[PDB]
Every structure is written in C-alpha cells, then in structure tokens.
UniProtKB/Swiss-Prot annotation, chains B, D:
This is Transthyretin. Belongs to the transthyretin family. Thyroid hormone-binding protein. Probably transports thyroxine from the bloodstream to the brain. Its main location: secreted. The chain holds residues 30 to 144 of 147 of the full protein. Changing residue 115 to S: In AMYLD1; uncertain significance. Changing residue 1 to R: In AMYLD1; amyloid polyneuropathy. It comes from Homo sapiens (Human). Changing residue 88 to G: In AMYLD1; amyloid polyneuropathy. Homotetramer. Dimer of dimers. In the homotetramer, subunits assemble around a central channel that can accommodate two ligand molecules. Interacts with RBP4.
Amino acid sequence: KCPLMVWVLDAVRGSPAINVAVHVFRKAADDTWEPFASGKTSESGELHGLTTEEEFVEGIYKVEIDTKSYWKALGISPFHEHAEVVFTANDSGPRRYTIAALLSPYSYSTTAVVTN
Amino acid sequence: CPLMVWVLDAVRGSPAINVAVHVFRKAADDTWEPFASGKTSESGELHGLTTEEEFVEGIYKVEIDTKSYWKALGISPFHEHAEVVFTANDSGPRRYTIAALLSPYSYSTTAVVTN
Amino acid sequence: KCPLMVWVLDAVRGSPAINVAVHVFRKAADDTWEPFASGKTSESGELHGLTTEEEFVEGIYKVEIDTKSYWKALGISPFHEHAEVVFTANDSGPRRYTIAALLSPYSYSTTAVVTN
Amino acid sequence: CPLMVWVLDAVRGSPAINVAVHVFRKAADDTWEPFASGKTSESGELHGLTTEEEFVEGIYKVEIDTKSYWKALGISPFHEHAEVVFTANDSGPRRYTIAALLSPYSYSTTAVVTN
C-alpha cells in the first residue's frame, strides 16, 4: 500500500518526535534534487502517504528531516541543520521502505526497514 | 591496555566525564564476580582496568552507570545502566574498546576488537 | 492496553529481527532477577502481550534480548552474548513502554518510547 | 586540527578503513562548494582536512562515502552516503570530531565539539 514511510523518535524525551517537517527529493537527469513529497510527522512520530506505488519509481531519493527546527521549538541547541537519508529505490520484487530516525541534539541514527 | 571504555554524551556533544564503570567476569558457579572498576576521565575514556595477564578468557559484563551520570546532570533518564555482555579472548588475547553513546532515553554501544 | 512491547530490527539486512528470544525479569526484594515474562519476536520484529496492566507494577525490570543466538542462526559471528535493557517502571499517570532495539554484529542501540 | 572524522564498522567491530570523505561549505549563492576531502586511515581516522585559518564560520556538509565502502567489501548497502550538515564556528573557533558508526542498512553519527 504505502511504499515510503518515515518514523522519527526523540531520544531525549523518549517519545515520538511530533510535527517534524520532512521533505523528500528525487534526483533529476541533470543531477539536481527535485521536490517529490513532504509532510510533518504525526502525534505518533509517523509520516504516511508521502507517495504512491505508481509515482515511486526506481531512482535516487533524499529524505531531509528538519531536526534543527524541531530542537529549537523545544528550547534545545542542536548540532545538525537537518538529517539526510539518501538511497536508491530498487524494484527487486514487492518492496516497502520505512526510514526510522532517532534524534539526539548532537547525534542521530537512521535505519531502513525494507520489506516484501 | 586490553580493555578500555569510551563514553560520549549525545545531548552535549562531549565526552561523558566521571561515568562509573563496573566490570564483572562470570565464575565457574555462573555468578558475576567483580573484576575491575573505574570512572571515565575528562576525555570520556577509562584506561587501566586490567592487564593482559589477568584478562583471561571468559564471559565479561561491563556495566556503565548511566543513571548516576544523568542524575548528577539533573536529567531523569530511562535506563538504570547500560550492560555490555561478551565473551573475551576465546581465540587468544585481543584488545577491546567498548564505546558507548548516551542519551536520556537511548544508548548505543559498539565494540572495536583488535589483534 | 499492552503496557510493555519490544521491537527488534536487523541493521545488516534492513529488516525486522524475527524469532529473537526475549526474556523479561523483575528485581525481587532479595536483589535477584526473577523471571517475569518471555516470548519470541514475530515476523514484524515485534513482541506483544508480555504482561498486563495489573501485573506490571512499579519495579526494576530487565529485558534480555538473545542477540547471539539470532546472529548464529544467520551464520554471522557476533560480539555480544545478549543485549540487556534495565529500567525502572514508574506510575506517573497512564504509561506504555516500547523498547526498540537495533542490532548489528558488533553494536546495538536501544531506545525507549514512553507514551500516555 | 579543527575538523576530524572517525568511522567505525559495526559488522566487523573495527575501524572503517579507506572510507572516502568529501566536505563542502555553503557559498553566498546557496550552492555547496568543495572544501576538503580525504580517506580514513587504518585507524578509521581522517585528519588534516583543514586549518584553523581556512575553517571559517559557515554551514558545512561532510559526505561519507558509505556505499563505496560497503561495495568494496561485497555488501549491497541501503544508503548512497551519510550526510552530516552543520553550522560551524558561529560562536568562535571550535574543534569538531564527527564520529560515524556504519552498518549496511543503518548508520549513526555523533559530533564531539570542543573549545
């Protein structure tokens, strides 16, 4: 159903990271990043419905997570401007991508869960 | 130095100083016997826990006292402590660096094992 | 509903970590760890139904995740015997705990998501 | 040394050797201008990227070429590269250590900022 989902967690509060802006880009033929989809994480730290199976073709995608704005709204001084997750989407049978990001003011981790 | 612990603070972006660390070794009776202990330095490092002679094969548990660290900084954390349990020197002596990255509700640990 | 859930992900395969044994213990008055609940992660890497709101009283709990057996079944030589997550469960209004663990052969990370 | 990069391999429990790193600085026209580059050593460290004089205030992007690293090891990874984007030296000169921990489908990055 949903081919690309983003989950964001807050490692300082131990909670979902709510209202985090997320911008997805697709690399164009001229090597520039073209806006593809965007949204804000929900109360559960999830962002669903970014794209459809039809539109999400093979290509290089960048998921930018606006971490600095998130920390600033919480009164915390962070290190990063934003987190970037860059990957190739490949048709190798049925696939769904979940990008999980765990945020700390001076650190972050990201993991991809790719399922059939 | 066959066993070292390095600890970083992901909130401050700095070494985690004065973090207590207790190391245990599993005895023949399956209990955890105290093996070594210390506190991280201003660089977040803890050296000199043991010697090549004393660090024989066995199952070791490195307990990093993260709750006491966060409490001293006025932060109420989730975990009591981080626990790193591993078999050491089962294919001969190795040097181990246990790296820990701390957040109030999360931590990560990684081992760098060198021959 | 479910007060304690465990999620386990595999950072080498980018997938849920399936059939991972998980043992939960509660610290007794004599300072020993008493078995409390156990199970295996599902096809989604989740373990639900470990306990009930009635049984999950305030106390110190240890969640042991049998990572070495998981890696060995995949033909991978890991560092840790198991991962341990030790925490105090506190009544501070309605609370649900999700313990998330991300596994690599020589590293792991754990995060707690505590919600109302 | 005001900017250093340390990279670890979470699969092998070892430093990640020969990892290419490219650093960019945001120009007045909002484009990313090449700033410095290098490869991690046998210890997983990359030193000497820049000097205190050249490392002025600005927004920097440290690109760690993780896909090329995993491909050279016969592992097909998820990410193209890891990207660490930050404002540097906005309250005066600081020393930055960017630490990255790599797995085929995951990575973590942490910054240690010292004055």
